[PDB]
Design an enzyme around this catalytic site. Sequence first.
Site, PDB file in Angstrom:
ATOM      1  N   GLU A  18      18.114  48.570  27.415  1.00 43.11           N
ATOM      2  CA  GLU A  18      16.656  48.314  27.004  1.00 43.11           C
ATOM      3  C   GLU A  18      15.948  49.567  26.715  1.00 43.11           C
ATOM      4  OE1 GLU A  18      15.734  45.567  26.650  1.00 43.11           O
ATOM      5  OE2 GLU A  18      16.839  44.048  27.601  1.00 43.11           O
TER       6      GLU A  18
ATOM      7  N   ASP B 217       9.792  44.321  20.515  1.00 37.54           N
ATOM      8  CA  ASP B 217      11.305  44.319  20.807  1.00 37.54           C
ATOM      9  C   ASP B 217      12.162  43.873  19.478  1.00 37.54           C
ATOM     10  OD1 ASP B 217      11.186  41.647  20.682  1.00 37.54           O
ATOM     11  OD2 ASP B 217      11.669  41.026  22.670  1.00 37.54           O
TER      12      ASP B 217
ATOM     13  N   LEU C 165       9.149  41.896  28.744  1.00 35.97           N
ATOM     14  CA  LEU C 165       8.274  41.079  27.585  1.00 35.97           C
ATOM     15  C   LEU C 165       7.096  40.861  28.145  1.00 35.97           C
ATOM     16  CD1 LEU C 165       8.360  39.304  25.169  1.00 35.97           C
ATOM     17  CD2 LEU C 165       9.298  37.388  26.608  1.00 35.97           C
TER      18      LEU C 165
ATOM     19  N   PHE D 136      18.775  38.634  31.689  1.00 33.59           N
ATOM     20  CA  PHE D 136      17.534  39.513  31.576  1.00 33.59           C
ATOM     21  C   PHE D 136      17.253  39.490  30.213  1.00 33.59           C
ATOM     22  CE2 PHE D 136      15.389  43.098  33.008  1.00 33.59           C
ATOM     23  CZ  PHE D 136      14.963  43.578  32.208  1.00 33.59           C
TER      24      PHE D 136
ATOM     25  N   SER E  35      31.316  28.981  26.891  1.00 32.51           N
ATOM     26  CA  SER E  35      31.687  30.410  27.488  1.00 32.51           C
ATOM     27  C   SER E  35      31.704  30.178  28.854  1.00 32.51           C
ATOM     28  CB  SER E  35      30.680  31.121  26.754  1.00 32.51           C
ATOM     29  OG  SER E  35      30.807  31.587  25.453  1.00 32.51           O
TER      30      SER E  35
ATOM     31  N   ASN F  97      34.664  33.390  22.198  1.00 33.21           N
ATOM     32  CA  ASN F  97      33.580  32.467  22.210  1.00 33.21           C
ATOM     33  C   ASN F  97      32.158  32.926  22.370  1.00 33.21           C
ATOM     34  OD1 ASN F  97      31.994  30.122  23.796  1.00 33.21           O
ATOM     35  ND2 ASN F  97      33.284  29.467  22.378  1.00 33.21           N
TER      36      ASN F  97
HETATM   37  C1  LIG Z   1      27.785  32.923  29.790  1.00 35.48           C
HETATM   38  C2  LIG Z   1      26.078  33.149  30.018  1.00 35.48           C
HETATM   39  C3  LIG Z   1      25.842  34.386  30.984  1.00 35.48           C
HETATM   40  C4  LIG Z   1      24.400  34.418  31.211  1.00 35.48           C
HETATM   41  C5  LIG Z   1      26.531  33.997  32.606  1.00 35.48           C
HETATM   42  C6  LIG Z   1      27.785  34.048  32.627  1.00 35.48           C
HETATM   43  C7  LIG Z   1      28.492  33.658  33.904  1.00 35.48           C
HETATM   44  C8  LIG Z   1      27.726  33.360  34.892  1.00 35.48           C
HETATM   45  C9  LIG Z   1      26.577  33.238  34.659  1.00 35.48           C
HETATM   46  C10 LIG Z   1      25.805  33.464  33.589  1.00 35.48           C
END
Ligand SMILES: CC[C@@H](C)c1ccccc1
Length: 164
Positions: free
Chosen positions: A11, A20, A32, A104, A117, A132
């Site tokens: 950051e 930003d 922010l 964040f 993901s 992914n």
């Molecule tokens: C994949 C989104 C990221 C914010 C995350 C990953 C693993 C556990 C919580 C959140």
Amino acid sequence: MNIFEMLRIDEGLRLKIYKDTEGYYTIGIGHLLTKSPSLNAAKSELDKAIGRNCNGVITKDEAEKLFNQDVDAAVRGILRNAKLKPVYDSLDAVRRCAAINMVFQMGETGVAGFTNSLRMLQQKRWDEAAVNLAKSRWYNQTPNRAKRVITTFRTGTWDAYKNL
Ligand SMILES: CC[C@@H](C)c1ccccc1
């Protein structure tokens, strides 16, 4: 390395109101202020956040205080979210930092589309998750930062940050 050092690298630190990567008024270490186009609106948010009339400028101590608050809020956000908490709890300490970093940057909101993901991370399919995660507006708009965060998820090491 820890989450504060990681986010400080990602950051930066600026003591005067700036825009930003998305064009939004921000200050300190990625705090922010508002998504409003009005600098006056941002100045008012800043004064409210700091508790004095700042005229768009803060001290390093004040920046670090907002940063502590913002990291705390990111973690709390994860723990309160029924989709995020179980994945976060399943992760090791280094990968938890990568998760906090994403929240964040994007909020709980901006992470909404990461269902697939999340599943791969929960399953500890690290290379698959990495592939992914890169299929995202996030990755395309901030590729250098996304690559660091993704490497952290892929490897569970600080290799992407150690040099800086
Ligand atoms: C994949 C989104 C990221 C914010 C995350 C990953 C693993 C556990 C919580 C959140």
